[PDB]
Amino acid sequence: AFKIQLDTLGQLPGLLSIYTQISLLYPVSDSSQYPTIVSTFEQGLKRFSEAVPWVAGQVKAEGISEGNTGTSFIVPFEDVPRVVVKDLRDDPSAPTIEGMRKAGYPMAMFDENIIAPRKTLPIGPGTGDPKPVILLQLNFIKGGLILTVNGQHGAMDMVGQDAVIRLLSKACRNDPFTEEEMTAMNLDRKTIVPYLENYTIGPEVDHQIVKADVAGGDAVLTPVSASWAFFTFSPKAMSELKDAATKTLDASTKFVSTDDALSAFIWKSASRVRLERIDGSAPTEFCRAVDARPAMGVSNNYPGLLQNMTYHNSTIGEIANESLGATASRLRSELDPASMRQRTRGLATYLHNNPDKSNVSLTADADPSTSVMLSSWAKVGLWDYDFGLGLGKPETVRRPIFEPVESLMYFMPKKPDGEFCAALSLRDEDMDRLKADKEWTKYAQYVG
Ligand SMILES: CC1=C[C@@H]2O[C@@H]3[C@H](O)C[C@](C)([C@@]2(CO)[C@H](O)C1=O)[C@]31CO1
Ligand SMILES: [Mg+2]
Ligand code: NA
Question: Where would I find the Trichothecene 3-O-acetyltransferase-like N-terminal domain in this sequence (predicted)?
C-alpha cells in the first residue's frame, strides 16, 4: 500500500483531467515474433511493478466539495499497469508500416482512437471511473509494432513520463535499476517544491489565474474548424534557423538554442499568417512549457510533475516583422534558473494556499486565436529505448492525433541526427496559409 500525494503543481485542474500520449514505431520482420514481444513486455511490467509498486496505481481525489477541489493521491489500483494488446494487421482502417514510411509518419496515422488505450481529453466512455497512473497499448500492424504509452498528467509531465518509460525498458531487458533511479522514483512529491512564506499573490503567478474579464483557460476547444499536422525540419533546416537567429540576437542575449530558434520561427510564422485576418496591433502571447527540475535542483529521473511555463507578450505585427533573433531573445530571456525557481515556488504556494484551485491554469490568459501554447519534448530520451524486444530502436516517435486544440503545439523527441518534428494545431484559415507560405515552407516540410 501507498498513498502518494501528487505534486502540488499536479493538483492543477487542467493536468488532473488529461492523459499525455506518445507512440513508438518499430519494424517487425515476421509475425512469428509477436508472442515473444508480448511476453517480454508483460514480464517487464511485472518486474517494474515489483520494484516500484506505485507505477501500477491510480490517481484518486478526496475531500472534494463546494469551493474545494480536493487533493489527489496515487493509491493502489491493480497488480501491474494495464497493457491492451490489439491486432490491427488485417484491419483495413489501421496504418501499415509501408503506408507510414511512404507518408513520412503523419500524425493522422496515429489515431488515438485506434492506437491508444485511452483518449487524451476526458471525452467519451470511461472518462467520468479510475484514472490509472500509466496505460499501455501494443498494436500489431502490417510489418510493425506501435507501442503507445499514456501518462496521467497530474502524476507526470513528459520528462517524468520519459523517466518511467526508460525504467520500463530496463525492466523489460531485466537490467538492474541504479540506486539513484530508485531514489528519484520515490522522492516525496508534496515537499519537492519549498513554499514561499506569508505569500498571498505576486507576479510569480502572472498569466496563471483566470479572471472574469480575460480570455483563456485549459484545453479550449474553439468553435472554429481546426486540425493537427506534423511538419518536419531537417538537421540542416534547424541549423540554418539557429544561424539566422544567432546573427540577429538582442544585445542582452549571449546565445540562443536550436529549440529557441524553432519556437521563435513558429511564433513569427503564425503571427505572419494571422495578419491576413487580424490587425498587427492585436496582442499575442507565447506560452512555453519548461521543465522545472533543473531550477529546483531535482534529478532528471524524478518521475512526477515539475513543469511550468514562460510567458512572452507582444503584438502580432511586432512578432511578424522583427528579426528571428529578436524573437528568440524574448524566449531565452525568461530562462534564468533563479527566476524559474521563484516563479515555480510562487505557483506551488498559491495552489497550496487555495482549496479552490479551479481558477489556476498554465494557459489562464492565452487567447487561442492569437496565442501559441508550445511544449517541447525535444530533449526526452525515447529514441533510445528497445524494451528488450530485439527490434532495434524506434523507427519513429510521434504523438497520437486527438481533437484540435487551437494554438496548441508540441516538438517531438529530437531524432538523434537532429531532425525536429513539430505538431501544430491551428484553425483551417491559419493552417492553409501557413502551408502555402514561402518563408515557412523554406524550412518546414508538411507531413500531416
Ligand atoms: C490538452 C493539453 C495538454 C497540454 O500539453 C502541454 C503540457 O503537457 C501542459 C500544457 C499546459 C497542456 C495542459 O492543458 C495544454 O495547455 C493542453 O491543453 C501544455 C501546453 O504546455
Ligand atoms: Mg472557479
Ligand atoms: Na547504483
Answer: 18-172
* Domain enclosing residue 249, as ranges: 202-378+404-448
197 domain-assigned = no
User: In Å, what is the CA distance from 93 to each residue of 83, 85, 89, 111?
Assistant: 22, 17, 10, 10
DSSP code string of 20-63? EEEEEEEE-S-GGGHHHHHHHHHHHHHHHHHHSGGGG-EEEEE-
Ligand 1 binding pocket, CB closer than 6 Å: 14, 18, 20, 120, 218-219, 289, 362-363, 373, 375, 405, 408
Method underlying the structure: X-ray
User: What residue has cell string 472554429?
Assistant: 224
Nearest CA to ligand 1 atom 19: 375
Q: How far apart are CA 221 and CA 405, in angstroms?
A: 5
Q: How far away, in angstroms, is 168 Cα from ligand 3 center?
A: 17
Closest ligand 1 atom number to CA of residue 309? 21
For 106-126, what is the HEC assignment?
Answer: CHHHCEHHHHCCCCCCCCCCC
Residue at 388: amino acid letter: G
Which runs of consecutive H residues, i.e. helices, occur in 90-204? 97-103, 112-115, 158-173, 179-184
Residues 322 and 394 in one domain: no
C-alpha cell at position 220: 479550449
Q: For a substitution probing ligand 1, which of 15, 18, 156 has the most ligand atoms within 8 Å of its CB?
A: 18
Complete edge-to-edge strand list for the sheet that includes strand 144-152 = 82-87, 134-141, 144-152, 19-27, 396-398
Residues 156 and 254 grouped into a single domain: no
Choose one of 16, 20, 373, 410 to mutate for the ligand 1 pocket test, by most ligand atoms within 8 angstroms of C-beta.
Answer: 373
- Give me the CATH number covering residue 305: 3.30.559.10
The answer for residues whose C-beta is within 8 angstroms of residue 270's C-beta and 6 or more apart is 372, 407, 426, 430, 434
Resolution (A): 1.9
